[PDB]
Design an enzyme around this catalytic site. Structure first.
Site, PDB file in Angstrom:
ATOM      1  CG  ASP A  34       2.603  -1.612   2.276  1.00 54.36           C
ATOM      2  OD1 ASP A  34       3.436  -0.728   1.226  1.00 54.36           O
ATOM      3  OD2 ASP A  34       1.758  -0.737   2.794  1.00 54.36           O
ATOM      4  CB  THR A  65      -1.020   0.549   1.237  1.00 55.08           C
ATOM      5  OG1 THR A  65      -1.901  -0.836   1.278  1.00 55.08           O
ATOM      6  CG2 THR A  65      -2.112   1.237   0.988  1.00 55.08           C
ATOM      7  CB  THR A  66       2.308   2.717   2.907  1.00 59.01           C
ATOM      8  OG1 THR A  66       1.037   3.072   3.551  1.00 59.01           O
ATOM      9  CG2 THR A  66       2.798   3.781   2.741  1.00 59.01           C
TER      10      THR A  66
END
EC number: 3.4.25.1
Lengths: 204, 215, 220, 199, 213, 191, 201, 191, 215, 199
Positions: F17, F1-2
């Site tokens: 991640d 995601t990040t």
């Protein structure tokens, strides 16, 4: 619209020392007319008329309700009603149905009880008063009557030219109108007498 | 409650011999943001039963308040009578049913564990009023994930010890940390006995990540 | 509709434009949007006209009752509390954009009211459809503790810029002055737009319309 | 759907209903009656939702009978018409609205004969001849072609014969038999039932 | 989501005289509750005897104007002569039906001379019908302007009023009166007036101001 | 995601991640969110999975073809232009969180970002993904111009640490990448 | 809007109103609805102006093509057929058109009726529009086959007058066309109010 | 919009932006977002405005009445309970970002948080508002247990600075509130 | 483009005597997040005209690419003729109308300013193809906010200087910083003359907040 | 909507449609014909959307005439029936569907008489008797009491008389005049137009 279900057109025009109110005669469903004798101008005391345009059911019910409260007021107090008193009463009667509104646009036309002072006002379907000096209009057709009355009105008018001006304005604006037509009633009142004329309109 | 703002997550509970252990985590996530990462999700009722819940935490606070008032009321009757946990389960089921019948749901999913008079009890209450008994409960995604582990071991062995059940709850909470997005590596274990009700501290899990070295 | 407020070195100068359009047609050229509340407090409205009028008359009635029951000068904050409590009780169905202003024993106090019930004490506010032009003129040329005629020129300038924006008025922008002693109220303040003269006499002669049935009824 | 016609004369009111009570495919009843005798000179006809017609019959018919037995004399047609319009206008704005289409026929000692005309939006009207449905249109063309205020009752019956001959020629509907009343100085006289073999 | 249309407003007037056609329009371009400019003349000089007006959605007005100019150039460069007025009317109607299922939201009025040298007004609709009339009012202010011209140009609903042929300067006073009286009550009208006059000698233009609100 | 990409003097530093999720259930617990294209140029993706995979594969196709026809090392701005074209031309359907980074011999380290719209801009640091907003909240707080490599490693470490800690969808494991003039040095932080 | 057409012994009568509104607003009072196709055909405007206009102009184009190819006047059924085929290709796409086709045939009088729905029919009497049922009623009162010239004119004129009297979407001048064996002929164009003054008593 | 509440050993420290907006237009450029209820207890609000103002008025009514009937200083938890009851009672209509804080003689400084749901929790620090996620991203980075007053002022200063800088709805000017045993210290800063 | 992702904000441009100044800010906000606080939103076309735009920035990049291609092509014709800014306006208007004709709108709001052959020029281009010439243009909220200052001063004085116009643009951008939520205190000023095209740097504003000390 | 019946005999097929071409309020045409003589022993009827009816009649009729002129001889009713079903099935899954309801009546030298029955969903059927519309709903019962496979043509005619007599009693549409064909070894013979005066 809901206002354009039964048609309707009411014009009032303030003259020099008199005032004139006129309306159409046609009553019917959306395109199918029924009759040519429907009253929309109702006498409320002497030298003081009211005009109603829009949904005819609200017209008759509001007229009878105003007649009710008007007779109770004039029998609690022996004097007759002033026009501003009528305007506040009508605004209160409409604003009681704030969220359950009637579908009408009342027009009040009357003179002064003490002097000969003319008076015009018109209201919205929730009770917004508005006093002017030239003319007020209501009903389905609007812009036609606005253009005609801004075209032909003068400030100081003898009752003959007032009569002919409101005559030509109503006839041309009704002939441009579709859902309202079939004859015109004209009430011209003054301090001396009350004159009621019916015009030879296009019955198309 | 039409729309739950701050939801909890899965709650696990299982009987053993002469006691029931219940554990849930401490996470106050709102949508996807873990907004409240230190909360309590298990109420210690008086001496026998115990409440754990999921769903809307404000509704859980409301039921905590009402149940605490009822329990303190019966204790101040002074008659020597308390509630069986099944009586609590009955009242809570009726409350949720009469709540949802008026088209206003309480967004909850509740687990009642209680040990009274030698017999253990483990009760479930749904939002829709679905209520039953079970030797092993698992709510939310716990019924999707850790329920087959419970049903594996209980079929392989119908009774348990306290230690086996505690380690099994540890393994199931480790699994729920492994693949739940609404999980968190901080949880509290609660256990009831005949000796009373005990809430342990905010324990943690021990993970493995050796599969990450592969491609 | 563009109403505005300001606080000068002593009191409050209020202004408004008086074109009551109904939809797309200019239905009015002269409509009193500055309302009475008290001898010290006034109010201006925007949005739905009759809702503002009925609410402002009702609160003026209640404040008259409270003032005559008390025996002294009312407070602006009481009007603020009454209006916000009523409008929150109607749950934002009644659309009433209000500007509240009066001078109490503490002095001048100006309030803006949004129809959900959010109220703010501010040195200058603008409300209505073309309020953004007056907010432009205010944020351009405001300074604290102005004089009387400077403030009048600023307010007239702001609503004049609103009328040079869309949905202003034909009107002679109405002004209202509240001071600690002297209450003023100026309807025909400044007429910028003279109506052009007629070019032909389009007059109806007496007899150009056929009449079907006449009727005469005398009176007294 | 169907339509019941209501011609005004000089000293008579010529009303004429149908006898049809069909239900969406089939004709359930071929001898139906929609005529509601209020008092000795006042009639009423009703077309609308067939659950509400019986209810208006109960309410208006029996309450006008209640006025008659109370006071001692018969209503004017105008006051009865206004009573009906007031009741429709009041029951309109409720959780149970009423959707019928009425038209009123009465006769006064002073005002003589009278015709009124309702709507499902509760409007009074004082008409020479009325309309509802689609027989509305097909009657109104010929009926406004051949109307005279000074018409005799036999010319009115003949006009109704002619209009019905035009009705049986260009509808979708069936409409086999029409029942006919008349009101005079005496009261309600039922004329013969007016049916037509088509071909 | 995205809407393909928006209403700019506008007001087009046309009067067919005996040997003249007077076409006038305001120059205000607006959107909703804003004013984009006070100078956008709706009239356009096509030939020495033809001026077209275009109101409604402004971008379709621009596109249609340029297409009409292109097809005029095609007719002239193919057929060695200018079009008539009625031929332009027919060609514009064919265009408006050629975009039937995605219509132009544009009202159109062509004023100009015939081949007899007489006044001619051709009205239009957004889908492409047309007719030859004496006077039309197009755009937002149509209902404010039709009945007054019915009283004055048509002499209609009038009794014992003879028919004088409408002169040029009397019609000029008429146009100035009707635009002032309409800008009193319309919100999509004012700030200027561009008057175009077709004679047998060319096009005359004239700029008359209005109220500034 | 990040996802996150930071340049410095020598080269750039990437990071993500893993935790590819669907609904509330995690489908994959460990994931190569960053993908090689050229031997010096990486990209990290977010939004939808298969869409960005197909975009990265087609960019790999065109870019390797172009780089072989040049017989030269390619530019990073070139691949950024390719992502801009393939994102914008048929946008309408795709959810791309593409961040382009890589050391270049002509131009050093560069970091470009392509958000879901299809625009392109060069930055000194970048965020991306739904759980990027928080460390975007303090990446303009903790950053200082002119870092070293290990400072960038610690910087992205703290960033992705708090992003994985706070965001519900984020979590899992830390993947880092060091690209400079010298070589590609990838490592995985965990625990 | 209300038109009618009916054929009899001496050709075909076609009449129409001239009112074409826009919602609740009258656009004009003099909209010439009966579109003159040929020296031998008459098309109408029945619901929608541009659709009736354009497609009858295209039909006139096609008939002129046919006549210049075959040196011979086309029949009425053929024109109704081509109109039906060219309209049918846009079914459901929102064309509003219910016009009438009149003309003289080698078979004699010819009367057809083509819709946008493809309801291609002949007949003897027709009436299209909003207040069309009114014209239906008063015409099928006054209809026969052996009617005279002035009788048919008065029937059609009375019919259009009653239609404009009752319906509100109808008015303007009453045009009156007459088709003979050789060609069509305008009879007259009368106003409503003149007929009200004439026929009201 | 963005509100912030930090306690320390002596008391609590509050803080907010101002910028009351509607749509994309700023209706009010400076707004008292924090509200006194009792003389040692504040609340700072978020979400809709009129809802929070009505709730603040009713809580002020009940709490002042209760404190006068006790003839004693009220508790912070009492106001927390009142806000919790009134928010949960009408949660179907309200959007409240209430944070209750203030010094208490029995319990020192305390901070309670009430989000849109109706739950009540005691915290050591709190965020609030739509533009709060960013400084929520680093409030678990920069905070240290056992600050002083000036450290809390600087902490909230940098917090509200970055929130007002980054978020579009945030901005305006910095309002601060200092509550301890001694007195109430409010100030308005910028920087 | 159906849904605008990354929009700019208001653009201000005004003619003066022998030149036109155009200025806008440097912000790339997405939703409510100021995601791209360092962007350029003004294209310097070859020597006379100049473009500023709003709305979706990717479409601005695309139009920048296309116009750069066209300008480079006519300059490589080598004939000594360039495009007038009105021709740029005409081409861009036809392009936008062809975009919205195919129901694929380019979510933009573009401002063209140019000075060539003695005359200044300032053109407007809408998403809808609505296009006109004007003495003073203001986009987005600028037509609601800073347009009355333009129409105030231009009525009070029809012509201006470079310094007067630059002063007024500084004031209007300060006001747009005061009450727009989509604003940022960093803007760049670009101005054309007969001496060429010049873009000034990332300037900022001078704010006042003394009204905050009132209650 | 309207009506048409399909009675089979031993060596004859008795079809009877109506003569109605109404449009939503009024009956525009009271002498319409829906009968399409395909060949010397094959008839065709059609009910549906009245723009698709004529187009489908065009295509089917002229293609069968084309087959006749090409191969020199007349089709079976069966192959023609399958051809019509084939064209419905091809026209259905398209952007341009047709919504018609058919039944085919033919006669072979070998197979003798045969009846088919279509649908708006392209189904073959070999019926003893079928119909369409709402007259279908009533008259298949009103016929199914009295069917015998070995029935004479006069019994079938009187059965149709009775069945029409029961249709004109409890039905809401008008349906005055029904035209009647018959098919034999000779060809298609038209019986007289069957209308009834109702009362």
């Amino acid at each position: 619209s809901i206002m354009s279900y039964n048609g309707g057109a009411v014009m009032a025009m303030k003259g020099k020392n008199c005032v004139a109110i006129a309306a159409d005669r046609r009553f019917g469903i959306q395109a199918q007319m029924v009759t040519t004798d429907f009253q929309k101008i109702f006498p409320m005391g002497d030298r003081l008329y009211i005009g109603l345009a829009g949904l005819a059911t609200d017209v008759q019910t509001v007229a009878q309700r105003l007649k009710f409260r008007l007779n109770l007021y004039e029998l609690k107090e022996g004097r007759q009603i002033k026009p501003y008193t009528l305007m506040s009463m009508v605004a209160n009667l409409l604003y009681e149905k704030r969220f359950g509104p009637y579908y009408t646009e009342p027009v009040i036309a009357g003179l002064d009880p003490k002097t000969f002072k003319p008076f015009i006002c018109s209201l919205d379907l929730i009770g917004c008063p508005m006093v002017t000096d030239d003319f007020v209009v209501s009903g389905t057709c609007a812009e036609q009557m606005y253009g005609m009355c801004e075209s032909l009105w003068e400030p100081n008018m003898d009752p003959d030219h007032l009569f002919e001006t409101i005559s030509q304005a109503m006839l041309n604006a009704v002939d441009r109108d579709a859902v309202s037509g079939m004859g015109v009633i004209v009430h011209i009142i003054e301090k001396d007498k009350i004159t009621t004329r019916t015009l030879k309109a296009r019955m198309d | 409650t039409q729309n739950p703002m701050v939801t909890g997550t899965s709650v696990l509970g299982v009987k053993f011999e002469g006691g029931v252990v219940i554990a849930a985590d401490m996470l106050g996530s709102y949508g996807s943001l873990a907004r409240f990462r230190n909360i309590s999700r298990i109420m210690r009722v008086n001496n026998s039963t115990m409440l754990g819940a999921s769903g809307d935490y404000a509704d859980f606070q409301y039921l905590k308040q009402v149940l605490g008032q009822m329990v303190i009321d019966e204790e101040l009757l002074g008659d020597g009578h308390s509630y069986s946990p099944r009586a609590i389960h009955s009242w809570l089921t009726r409350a949720m049913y009469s709540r949802r019948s008026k088209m206003n749901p309480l967004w909850n999913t509740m687990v009642i564990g209680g040990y009274a008079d030698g017999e253990s009890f483990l009760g479930y209450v749904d939002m829709l009023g679905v209520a039953y008994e079970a030797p092993s409960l698992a709510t939310g995604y716990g019924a999707y994930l850790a329920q087959p582990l419970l049903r594996e071991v209980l079929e392989k062995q119908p009774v348990l010890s306290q230690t086996e059940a505690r380690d099994l709850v540890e393994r199931c909470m480790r699994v729920l940390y492994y693949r739940d997005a609404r999980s968190y590596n901080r949880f509290q274990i609660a256990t009831v006995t005949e000796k009373g009700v005990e809430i342990e501290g905010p324990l943690s899990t021990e993970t493995n990540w050796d599969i990450a070295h592969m491609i | 509709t563009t109403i505005a407020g300001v606080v000068y070195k002593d009191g409050i100068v209020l202004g408004a434009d008086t074109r009551a359009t109904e939809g797309m047609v200019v239905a009015d050229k002269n409509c009193s949007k500055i309302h009475f509340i008290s001898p010290n407090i006034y109010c201006c409205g925007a949005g739905t006209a009759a809702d503002t009028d009925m609410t402002t008359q009702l609160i003026s009635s209640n404040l008259e009752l409270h003032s005559l029951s008390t025996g002294r000068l009312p407070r602006v904050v009481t009007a603020n509390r009454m209006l916000k409590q009523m409008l929150f009780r109607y749950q934002g169905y009644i659309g009433a954009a209000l500007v509240l202003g009066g001078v109490d024993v503490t002095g001048p106090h100006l309030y803006s009211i949004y129809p959900h019930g959010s109220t703010d004490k501010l040195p200058y506010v603008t409300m209505g459809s073309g309020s953004l032009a007056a907010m432009a003129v205010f944020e351009d040329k405001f300074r604290p503790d102005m004089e009387e005629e400077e403030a009048k020129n600023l307010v007239s300038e702001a609503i004049a810029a609103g009328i040079f924006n869309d949905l202003g008025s034909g009107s002679n922008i109405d002004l209202c002055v509240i001071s600690k002693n002297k209450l003023d109220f100026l309807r025909p303040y400044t007429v910028p737009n003279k109506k052009g003269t007629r070019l032909g006499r389009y007059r109806c002669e007496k007899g150009t319309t056929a009449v079907l049935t006449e009727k005469i009824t005398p009176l007294e | 759907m169907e339509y019941l016609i209501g011609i005004q004369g000089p000293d008579y009111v010529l009303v004429a209903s149908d006898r049809v009570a069909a239900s969406n495919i089939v004709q359930m009843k071929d001898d139906h009656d929609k005529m509601f005798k209020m008092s000795e000179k006042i009639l009423l006809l009703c077309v609308g939702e067939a659950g509400d017609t019986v209810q208006f019959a109960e309410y208006i018919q029996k309450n006008v009978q209640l006025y008659k037995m109370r006071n001692g004399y018969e209503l004017s047609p105008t006051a009865a018409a206004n009573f009906t319009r007031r009741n429709l206008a009041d029951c309109l704005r409720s959780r149970t609205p009423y959707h019928v289409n009425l038209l009123l026929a009465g006769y006064d000692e002073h005002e003589g004969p009278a015709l009124y005309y309702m709507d499902y939006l509760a409007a009074l009207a004082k008409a020479p001849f009325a309309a509802h449905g689609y027989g509305a249109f097909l009657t109104l063309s010929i009926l406004d072609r051949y109307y005279t205020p000074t018409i005799s009752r036999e010319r009115a019956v003949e006009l109704l014969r002619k209009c019905l001959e035009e009705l049986q020629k260009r509808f979708i509907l069936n409409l086999p038999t029409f029942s006919v009343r008349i009101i005079d100085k005496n009261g309600i006289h039922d004329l013969d039932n007016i049916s037509f073999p088509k071909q | 989501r995205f809407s393909p249309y928006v209403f700019n407003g506008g007001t087009i007037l046309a009067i067919a005289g005996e040997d003249f056609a007077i076409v006038a329009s305001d120059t205000r371009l607006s959107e909703g509750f804003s004013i984009h400019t006070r100078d956008s003349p709706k009239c356009y000089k096509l030939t020495d005897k033809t001026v077209i007006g275009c109101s409604g959605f402004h971008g379709d007005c621009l596109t249609l104007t340029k297409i009409i100019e292109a097809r005029l150039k095609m007719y002239k460069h193919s057929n060695n002569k200018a079009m008539t007025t009625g031929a332009i009317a027919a060609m514009l109607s064919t265009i408006l039906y050629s975009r039937r299922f995605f219509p132009y939201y544009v009202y159109n009025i062509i004023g100009g001379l015939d081949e007899e040298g007489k006044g001619a007004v051709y009205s239009f609709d957004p889908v492409g019908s047309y007719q030859r009339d004496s006077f039309k009012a197009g755009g937002s202010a149509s209902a404010m302007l039709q009945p007054l011209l019915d009283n004055q140009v048509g002499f209609k609903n009038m009794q014992n009023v003879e028919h004088v042929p409408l002169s040029l300067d009397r019609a000029m006073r008429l146009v100035k009166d009707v635009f002032i009286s309409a800008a009193e009550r319309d919100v999509y009208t004012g700030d200027a007036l561009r008057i175009c006059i077709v004679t047998k000698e060319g096009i005359r233009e004239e700029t008359v101001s209005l109220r500034k609100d | 995601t990040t996802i996150m990409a930071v340049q410095f003097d020598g080269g750039v530093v990437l990071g993500a991640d893993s935790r590819t999720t669907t609904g509330s259930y995690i489908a994959n617990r460990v994931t190569d969110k960053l993908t090689p294209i050229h031997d010096r140029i990486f990209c990290c993706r977010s939004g939808s999975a298969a869409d960005t995979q197909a975009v990265a594969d087609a960019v790999t196709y065109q870019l390797g073809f172009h780089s072989i026809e040049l017989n030269e090392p390619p530019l990073v701005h070139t691949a950024a232009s390719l992502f801009k074209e393939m994102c914008y031309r048929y946008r309408e359907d795709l959810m791309a969180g593409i961040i382009i980074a890589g050391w270049d011999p002509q131009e050093g380290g560069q970091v470009y970002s392509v958000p879901m719209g299809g625009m392109m801009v060069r930055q000194s640091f970048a965020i991306g993904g739904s759980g990027s907003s928080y460390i975007y909240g303090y990446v303009d707080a903790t950053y200082r111009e002119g870092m070293t490599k290990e400072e960038c490693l610690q910087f992205t470490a703290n960033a992705l640490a708090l992003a994985m800690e706070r965001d519900g969808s984020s979590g899992g494991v830390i993947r880092l990448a060091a690209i400079a003039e010298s070589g590609v040095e990838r490592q995985v932080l965990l625990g | 809007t209300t038109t009618l057409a009916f054929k009899f012994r001496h050709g075909v009568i076609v009449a129409a109103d001239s009112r074409a509104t826009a919602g609740a607003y009258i656009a004009s009072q003099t909209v010439k609805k009966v579109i003159e196709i040929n020296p031998y055909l008459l098309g109408t405007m029945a619901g929608g102006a541009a659709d009736c206009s354009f497609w009858e102009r295209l039909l006139a184009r096609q008939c002129r093509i046919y006549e210049l190819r075959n040196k011979e006047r086309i029949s009425v059924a053929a024109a109704s057929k081509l109109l039906a085929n060219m309209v049918y290709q846009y079914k459901g796409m929102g064309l509003s058109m219910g016009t009438m086709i009149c003309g003289w045939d080698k078979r004699g009088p010819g009367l057809y009726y083509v819709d946008s729905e493809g309801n291609r029919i002949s007949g003897a009497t027709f009436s299209v529009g909003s207040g069309s049922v009114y014209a239906y009623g008063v015409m099928d009162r006054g209809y026969s086959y052996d009617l005279e010239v002035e009788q048919a004119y008065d029937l059609a004129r009375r019919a259009i007058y009653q239609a404009t009297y009752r319906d509100a979407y109808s008015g303007g001048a009453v045009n009156l066309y007459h088709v003979r064996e050789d060609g069509w002929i305008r009879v007259s164009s009368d106003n409503v109010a003149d007929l009200h003054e004439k026929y009201s008593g």
